[PDB]
Amino acid sequence: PTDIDLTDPDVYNRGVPHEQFAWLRRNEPVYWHPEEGYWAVTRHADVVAVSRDPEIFSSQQGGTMIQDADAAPEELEKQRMMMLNMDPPQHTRLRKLVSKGFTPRMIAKLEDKIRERAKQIVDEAIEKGECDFVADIAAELPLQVIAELIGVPQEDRQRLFDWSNRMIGYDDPEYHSSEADGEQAAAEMFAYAQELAAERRKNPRDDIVTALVQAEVDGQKLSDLEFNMFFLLLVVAGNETTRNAISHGMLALLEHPDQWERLRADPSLAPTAVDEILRWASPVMSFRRTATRDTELGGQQIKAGDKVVMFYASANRDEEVFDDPYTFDITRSPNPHLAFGGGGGPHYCLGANLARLEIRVMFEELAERMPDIELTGPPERLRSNFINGIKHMPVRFT
Ligand code: HEM
Numbered sequence: 001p002t003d004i005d006l007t008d009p010d011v012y013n014r015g016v017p018h019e020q021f022a023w024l025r026r027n028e029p030v031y032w033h034p035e036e037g038y039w040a041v042t043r044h045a046d047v048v049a050v051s052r053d054p055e056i057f058s059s060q061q062g063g064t065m066i067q068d069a070d071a072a073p074e075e076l077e078k079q080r081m082m083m084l085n086m087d088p089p090q091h092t093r094l095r096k097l098v099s100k101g102f103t104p105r106m107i108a109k110l111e112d113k114i115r116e117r118a119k120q121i122v123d124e125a126i127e128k129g130e131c132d133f134v135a136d137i138a139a140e141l142p143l144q145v146i147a148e149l150i151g152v153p154q155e156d157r158q159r160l161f162d163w164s165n166r167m168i169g170y171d172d173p174e175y176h177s178s179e180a181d182g183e184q185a186a187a188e189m190f191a192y193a194q195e196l197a198a199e200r201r202k203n204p205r206d207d208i209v210t211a212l213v214q215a216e217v218d219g220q221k222l223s224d225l226e227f228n229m230f231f232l233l234l235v236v237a238g239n240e241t242t243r244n245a246i247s248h249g250m251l252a253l254l255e256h257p258d259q260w261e262r263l264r265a266d267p268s269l270a271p272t273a274v275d276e277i278l279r280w281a282s283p284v285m286s287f288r289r290t291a292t293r294d295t296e297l298g299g300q301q302i303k304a305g306d307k308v309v310m311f312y313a314s315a316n317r318d319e320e321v322f323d324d325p326y327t328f329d330i331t332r333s334p335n336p337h338l339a340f341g342g343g344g345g346p347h348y349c350l351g352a353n354l355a356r357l358e359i360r361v362m363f364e365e366l367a368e369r370m371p372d373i374e375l376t377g378p379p380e381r382l383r384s385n386f387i388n389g390i391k392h393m394p395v396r397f398t
């Protein structure tokens, strides 16, 4: 087709450009886009290869955002204490410090409380009748859960939601008002997080803030900025990913009504349904790396300093991996999708167990309760070159 600029948010205004991805996978799977420029990596195996080699494909050298913020090097330095933008050994140490609360056994203990919240959220949405599926359901469950898990009082959860909207929504006019919105949001959140850390140091609780201030690995503890940036990461990741998998998942189930019928008849399909909802929605569309040295990928020569972009949404339609990839099949198995990153990468989603649980519980509850969910208008996409997000989705229940 054309040589679309896949770092341009407007390219995604009418949905994920899956035909361009499909053409690239078949014809130019490792493709240099000129513009200085970037390599588009669109095949499943190549995204896996890039992800599992941080020595060659660095997250630190040029950060992980896909658009050229090169001549503003102050924004790279403002984000370099983000765990996402660290290479080993720095990243290894930080990941060990923060990982304890997200092991499967730690996440498994949350299922009953998550289920209680999802049941109440769905109940209140059903009584409301007409509502926004995002604000009242898809956003509300992960927001309540992430507040309770972190240790933020439920009364303050709306501040968490507004902050993270301002931090990721820098390309959407509704979510942000000026170029310093996210920086100011970060300053406010850092002040809030430090208050919480101070309280839990004096008086520990069973929450993630207490786990973080108490954590100690190899004689190391979290510094103030390390704590602040992980607190931020948890809040934003918790509020800007799961809700989009839920929104796009509900949309796909309504757009493929036979699949929704079968989930409501057999709720034991929910685990595989979650993975197909993640493959389908690919809420995190892409992440960037930078080649630390000359190297070859898919028979293509990548130089030191070259920007390399992994497109997870393209990999999640790779015909070599998924049979009939444009079919939404909630029983698809196996389903080695890359929605959480390439398998084998050191940055593979720390919250993957929590995300799956939240999505599974929510759609179970939406299924067990069997209201007739129906769209009353077109969903409004988030303007972004990074998130595949739904801002609003008006629906009617029963
Ligand atoms: C719900 C859908 C989610 C998706 C699709 C998603 C996607 C991703 C992706 C693609 C990465 C980077 C992988 C890589 O670079 O190799 C990542 C990293 C990460 N995610 Fe998730 N995520 C989700 C939910 C969550 C949640 C709920 C949390 C925590 C509350 C979370 C916490 C993190 C953290 C801390 C990292 C950085 C790990 C590191 O750098 O070592 N994520 N996520």
Ligand SMILES: CC[C@H](CC[C@@H](C)[C@H]1CC[C@H]2[C@@H]3CC=C4C[C@@H](O)CC[C@]4(C)[C@H]3CC[C@]12C)C(C)C
Pocket: 078, 079, 082, 084, 167, 168, 182, 183, 184, 186, 232, 233, 236, 237, 240, 241, 284, 387
């Ligand atoms: C939903 C995806 C999820 C998390 C990715 C987040 C944590 C990345 C995305 C956008 C970044 C911000 C951009 C601009 C600035 C301004 C700066 O002054 C302070 C740092 C800050 C807020 C950056 C803070 C970090 C942000 C939110 C998954 C994939 C981990």
